[PDB]
Amino acid sequence: MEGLKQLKDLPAETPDGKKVMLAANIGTPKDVASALANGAEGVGLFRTEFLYMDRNSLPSEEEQFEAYKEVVEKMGGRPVTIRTLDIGGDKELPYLDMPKEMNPFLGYRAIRLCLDRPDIFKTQLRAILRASAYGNVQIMYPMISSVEEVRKANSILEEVKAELDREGVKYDKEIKVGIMVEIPSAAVTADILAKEVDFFSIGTNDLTQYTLAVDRMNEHVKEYYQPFHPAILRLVKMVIDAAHKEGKFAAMCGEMAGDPLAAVILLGLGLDEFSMSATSIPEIKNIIRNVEYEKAKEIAEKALNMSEAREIEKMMKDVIKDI
Amino acid sequence: EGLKQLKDLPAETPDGKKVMLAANIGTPKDVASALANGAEGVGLFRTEFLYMDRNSLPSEEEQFEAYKEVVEKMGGRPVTIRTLDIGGDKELPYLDMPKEMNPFLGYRAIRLCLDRPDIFKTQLRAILRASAYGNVQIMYPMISSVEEVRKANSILEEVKAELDREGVKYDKEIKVGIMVEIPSAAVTADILAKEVDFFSIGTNDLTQYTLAVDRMNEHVKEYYQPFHPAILRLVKMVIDAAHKEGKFAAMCGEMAGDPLAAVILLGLGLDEFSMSATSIPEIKNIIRNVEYEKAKEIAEKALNMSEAREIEKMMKDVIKDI
């Protein structure tokens, strides 16, 4: 159990040899310095909303390319998982002419908006592909409910690769493309999805809201938001096993991956990559390095055996005290 | 074969598997059509009519008379009454519901009831009293967890006790179950099964929540896909879990009245299909013309597919074969 300075370049590896990747969640190129300072082994989630927010026009391909390239370069070969536009009309960005909706979190947002406006989508995919020439880039589509949507998005991505091929512009021909798991059907169908994605990243904040049908930002029902509800851990297990079966990796970029309480459970379920606010890295690292993977599997099994979030919460608190 | 003939015939497969066909009603007036169509019960008595287009809450007495009416007219057939199932998207001046960004994921239905137990008790007292007059079940909507079921029952039990102290009769064996619509309820159906008398699958809302789509939103209505394999897998999870505990599984979502789904639902072992009255004969006709042994094979096939469009194409074929 050690200090930050010492932990920085030590691996997140249990005493019995299981290693996991601890990576950072960022929302602007400026977040990279902190990320490296805490020993981030990649970016598990580069949110790209910053390029569309606080302005009255679409970000140009050039502008996005520069921001993506910056991060990719600075991470020095470490994987950078760029999530495509994941914005809905709940965010007032007038130039996007979003429709006024009763339930925006259930509406025309993210991948749905991108599929309906392939022009916007193409511009972003071209910037990401161009940036992949300079480092280790993965693409993550959000808001995916079905393998049919992944097919539609990849057909647009293939269209963009071919323009780039025509133009003599370089990109990583082997670029990895996965999806964020947040719509419940994506976890319920991960076996079907796992055949056509390169990885999954579990957006647990969003998955919890959809699965428990709760808007966590609604003050009148915030208590219904319970990430430790057994349904959430069951969906996570489903997603991880399904990735693994097809030989693909499972990451988690939801808040839960940076929560000390969840660490041993995640480790035991076999999560491959934990992605989180950079300052959380050392804390989860200390946990993984001090808990045997065999014992973590056992803890995850016990947690999976429980019927109530609060019992799971209480047990994890005990596990973390025991150290 | 024709409607007249079908009315009194059971929805039983040629190989002997009987299921229950029931009606969804929205107001006591709906009972006539239900019976005219051979309804064997009411699988969903929506109670929103009692709260809408008015200036204050419906009294226990107004509710009890409406519940009593349907319960009596159903002559012994089970009437499943769903407790208040709405939120602030509604026209409910008198409640001062909060403005909400996503009301469908908000302060509605059981959550309103738990926070307003004054409202919940009035309705549960009316239902319990109506239960002395016939065959009544209680269904709580918008359940995400077994803890919520316990909270609701705790209130039910305190009303039962008020009624006891007051000398008022109610069915002491009244069955209480839940509508399965929030995905976590299907995913944890095994846990819930130990604490509910039955499950009724609300496929319309289950589909919207599972696919994260508001089907009333024109801009994304194409994302609403009741035949996505996730929906079928969740329906199976629920039926299987109920049955392992010796409990029954009903379906009151639109899918239950859909001819394309009938054979799948049948082969999945669904026990009760509840639907708009006029849809009853059409489903009965299908159930009466397909062997359950065949239906199980067909449900297996559908469960092994990967795309809604393919399941739908297959079910169109099945329906033609007749």
Q: SS3 for A293-315, per residue?
A: HHHHHHHHHHHHCCCCHHHHHHH
Triad A125, A128, A131: Cα angle to 5°: 150
The C-alpha atoms of residue A43 and residue A47 are separated, in whole angstroms, by 10
| In contact, A44 and A23? CB cutoff 8 Å | yes
Compute the residue count for chain B: 322
Nearest CA in chain B to A151: B307
How many angstroms away from the CA of A232 is the closest CA of chain B? 8
Residues of B in contact with A185 (CB under 8 A): 210-212, 228, 230-231
Q: Which residues pair with A139 in a beta bridge?
A: A82, A177
Distance from C-alpha of B147 to C-alpha of B153, rounded to nearest angstrom:
10
- Residue B307: its chain A contacts at CB < 8 A? 146-148
A108 touches chain B (CB under 8 A): yes
Contact A144, A179 (CB under 8 A): yes
Q: Are A147 and A189 in contact (CB under 8 A)?
A: yes
> Residues A98, A103, A104, A106: what is their CA dihedral angle, to the nearest 10 degrees?
-120
Q: Does B27 touch chain A (CB under 8 A)?
A: no
* B 201-230 residues inside an 8 A Cβ radius of A: 208-214, 216-217, 219-220, 223, 225, 228-230
CA A85 to chain B, closest CA, distance in angstroms equals: 17
B234 contacts A145? CB cut-off 8 A: no
**Closest partner residue to A188 among B100, B230, B309, by Cβ?**
B230
| Exposure string for A97-108, b = 16+ CB within 10 A, e = fewer | ebeebebbbbbb
Q: Name every residue whose Cβ is closer than 8 Å to that of residue B204 and which is 6 or more positions away in sequence.
A: B181, B215, B253, B254, B255
Determine whether the interchain pair A189/B142 forms a contact, defined as Cβ–Cβ distance below 8 Å. Answer: no
Experimental method: X-ray
Q: Which chain A residues are Cβ-neighbours of B228 within 8 angstroms? A: 145-146, 185, 189
The secondary structure element, H or E, covering residue B177 is strand B175-180
Contact A211 B111 (CB under 8 A): no
The length of chain A is: 323
Cβ contact A213–B183 (<8 Å): yes
DSSP state of A9: T
**Phi, psi for residue B249 in degrees, rounded to 5:** -120, 125
A184 in B contact zone (CB under 8 Å): yes
Rounded Cα–Cα distance for residues A216 and B109 (Å): 17
Domains defined for chain B, CATH in brackets? 1-322 (3.20.20.60)
Resolution at which this structure was determined, Å: 1.8
Using a CB-CB distance cutoff of 8 angstroms, which residues of chain A are in contact with residue B107? 218, 220-221
d(CA B142, CA A238): 24
Active site (catalytic) residues of A: 253
Closest by CA position to B45, among listed B84, B8, B103: B84
Q: Output the CA angle A198-A200-A205, nearest 5 degrees.
A: 160
Question: Please, which residues 129-168 of chain B have a Cβ atom closer than 8 Å to chain A?
Answer: 142, 144-147
Catalytic residues of B: 252
DSSP type of residue A145: -
Identify residue A240 by its one-letter amino acid code.
I
> Minimal CA–CA distance to B195: which of B231, B143, B159, B267?
B143
Name, in order, each residue with C-beta under 8 angstroms of A168's C-beta and a sequence gap of 6 or more.
none
Q: Does B45 touch chain A (CB under 8 A)?
A: no
- The whole-angstrom separation of Cα A26 and Cα A148 is 29
CA distance B312 to B228: 10
Chain B contact set for A231 (CB, 8 A) = 183-185, 187-188
Q: Does A60 touch chain B (CB under 8 A)?
A: no
The continuous run of DSSP H or E covering B198 comes out as strand B198-201
State the Cα–Cα distance between residues B198 and B239, nearest whole angstrom: 10
End-to-end Cα distance, chain A: 9
Backbone phi and psi for residue B54, each to the nearest 5 degrees, phi listed first: -160, 170
